[PDB]
Amino acid sequence: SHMSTIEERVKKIIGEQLGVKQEEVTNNASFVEDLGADSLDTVELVMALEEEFDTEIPDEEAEKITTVQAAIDYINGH
Amino acid sequence: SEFLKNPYSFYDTLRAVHPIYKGSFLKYPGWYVTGYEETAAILKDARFKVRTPLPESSTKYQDLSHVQNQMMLFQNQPDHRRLRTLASGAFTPRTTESYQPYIIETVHHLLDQVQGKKKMEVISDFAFPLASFVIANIIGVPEEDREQLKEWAASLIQTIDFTRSRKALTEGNIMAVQAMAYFKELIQKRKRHPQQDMISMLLKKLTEEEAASTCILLAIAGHETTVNLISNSVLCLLQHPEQLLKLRENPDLIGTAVEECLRYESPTQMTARVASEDIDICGVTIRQGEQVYLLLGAANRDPSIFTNPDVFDITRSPNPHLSFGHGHHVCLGSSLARLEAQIAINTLLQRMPSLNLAWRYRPLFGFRALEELPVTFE
Numbered sequence: 001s002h003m004s005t006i007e008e009r010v011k012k013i014i015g016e017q018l019g020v021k022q023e024e025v026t027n028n029a030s031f032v033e034d035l036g037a038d039s040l041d042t043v044e045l046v047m048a049l050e051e052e053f054d055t056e057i058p059d060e061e062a063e064k065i066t067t068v069q070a071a072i073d074y075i076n077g078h
Numbered sequence: 079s080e081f082l083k084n085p086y087s088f089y090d091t092l093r094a095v096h097p098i099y100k101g102s103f104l105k106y107p108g109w110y111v112t113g114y115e116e117t118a119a120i121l122k123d124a125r126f127k128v129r130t131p132l133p134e135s136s137t138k139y140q141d142l143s144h145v146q147n148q149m150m151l152f153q154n155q156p157d158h159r160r161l162r163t164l165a166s167g168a169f170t171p172r173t174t175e176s177y178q179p180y181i182i183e184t185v186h187h188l189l190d191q192v193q194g195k196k197k198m199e200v201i202s203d204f205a206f207p208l209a210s211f212v213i214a215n216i217i218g219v220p221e222e223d224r225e226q227l228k229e230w231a232a233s234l235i236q237t238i239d240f241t242r243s244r245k246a247l248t249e250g251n252i253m254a255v256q257a258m259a260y261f262k263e264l265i266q267k268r269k270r271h272p273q274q275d276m277i278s279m280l281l282k283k284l285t286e287e288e289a290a291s292t293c294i295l296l297a298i299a300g301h302e303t304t305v306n307l308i309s310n311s312v313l314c315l316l317q318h319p320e321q322l323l324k325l326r327e328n329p330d331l332i333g334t335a336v337e338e339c340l341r342y343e344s345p346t347q348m349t350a351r352v353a354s355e356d357i358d359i360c361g362v363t364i365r366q367g368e369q370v371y372l373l374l375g376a377a378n379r380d381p382s383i384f385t386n387p388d389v390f391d392i393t394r395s396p397n398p399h400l401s402f403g404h405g406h407h408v409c410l411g412s413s414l415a416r417l418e419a420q421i422a423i424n425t426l427l428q429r430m431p432s433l434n435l436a437w438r439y440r441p442l443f444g445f446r447a448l449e450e451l452p453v454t455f456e
């Protein structure tokens with residue numbers, strides 16, 4: 001057992017939001033194409049990540065993030 | 079916080095770039111329209127369609143989505159005309175004028191409760207109770223169930239705003255269940271025993287769920303926006319004591335004064351459309367599927383239509399503001415809203431000869447709504 005890593009925290013959020021298992025979320029998976037996120041899901045995902053990691057993502061940067069790895073990569077910075 | 083205190087400086091910066099501005103605010107990308115001519119043209123154009131404020135096929139908030147999607151405000155052809163025509167009977171000039179006695183008597187009753195106190199909160203003591211009493215009376219909601227309506231309205235209005243959260247939408251879904259269940263029950267009673275109200279008029283073609291969502295829509299509109307018009311107008315006049323003296327000395331100026339209050343501090347700051355095809359306007363191309371956000375308060379400050387647009391002038395004539403929208407979806411209850419505001423403000427100024435200010439705006443971007451408005455008098 002261990003404390004939640006950055007990756008585990010990101011994937012739990014995505015899983016709870018999109019109704020998929022936290023295992024089933026792969027790092028290279030696209031939110032819209034692979035995971036099936038609609039035009040509300042993606043907004044609520046950013047909100048959830050902002051809340052979880054106590055950060056503020058500008059609309060410019062959020063537009064860049066389209067895959068799970070990109071979300072993880074952004075949080076490891078910033 | 080700085081945006082809420084003065085959004086018009088923000089609108090001005092967008093307008094200087096382009097009256098149709100491509101950008102993204104609060105994570106919502108699209109075209110943000112600050113120009114008057116552009117706003118009016120888009121609202122007039124049926125190619126720019128209304129749409130559900132949550133994704134069409136989303137069942138995350140299943141009950142909230144169902145309630146919203148049945149409302150005429152988010153419906154296009156041919157369902158829009160059907161729904162609008164059926165509800166229109168309660169808001170005709172003639173029927174609206176017949177509400178005047180009840181509005182005058184309610185206004186006096188509410189001011190009686192505070193007359194001796196030398197102090198009041200304009201929203202809680204005056205603006206809200208009036209608007210709540212009037213709309214509940216028109217719809218046919220019993221006086222015992224009036225407080226429950228207030229809670230539903232305040233919760234459901236947030237579900238359409240940019241400032242909405244996961245928590246607000248979850249709360250919204252619960253209130254959607256409650257409101258729909260209540261109006262279905264009230265419809266069953268009116269089916270057996272019709273009364274002199276709008277529910278009965280609706281039942282006299284429309285499903286019982288479409289009637290319920292119609293009632294919910296009118297209940298929210300009757301509460302939220304009309305309350306804001308009254309309270310915004312009072313603040314406006316008190317911040318400009320010089321056309322408040324002027325309206326006090328001549329109550330016949332109430333008509334043109336209310337219109338300038340509508341232009342200057344519009345209760346509704348935003349509405350929205352989606353492009354159903356590729357559309358060329360004002361030297362830009364809006365592609366199919368892209369979202370268009372019409373900033374009505376910004377359009378009302380367009381210096382090419384209103385000279386010295388940041389000046390509050392109650393003698394402005396005419397006043398072709400867009401506060402009630404434009405085109406097919408133009409406000410259904412605009413006559414009622416105007417009447418409530420006219421009577422409320424004129425009577426207040428008559429009965430409180432020495433009215434003075436003792437401010438915070440609610441965290442809504444699509445609406446300009448005060449948290450409270452404490453005043454003193456006599």
Ligand code: HEM
Nearest residue numbers: 150151299300303304345349401402403407409410411415
């Ligand atoms: C009891 C008072 C009110 C009632 C019953 C009411 C009702 C309605 C209804 C049913 C619609 C939908 C019409 C349609 O889709 O065809 C509508 C539209 C609209 N209302 Fe009102 N309303 C009220 C007050 C107000 C106020 C005070 C304002 C702001 C000054 C306002 C602003 C608007 C706007 C801008 C639209 C059109 C929005 C769009 O085109 O997307 N309403 N109203």
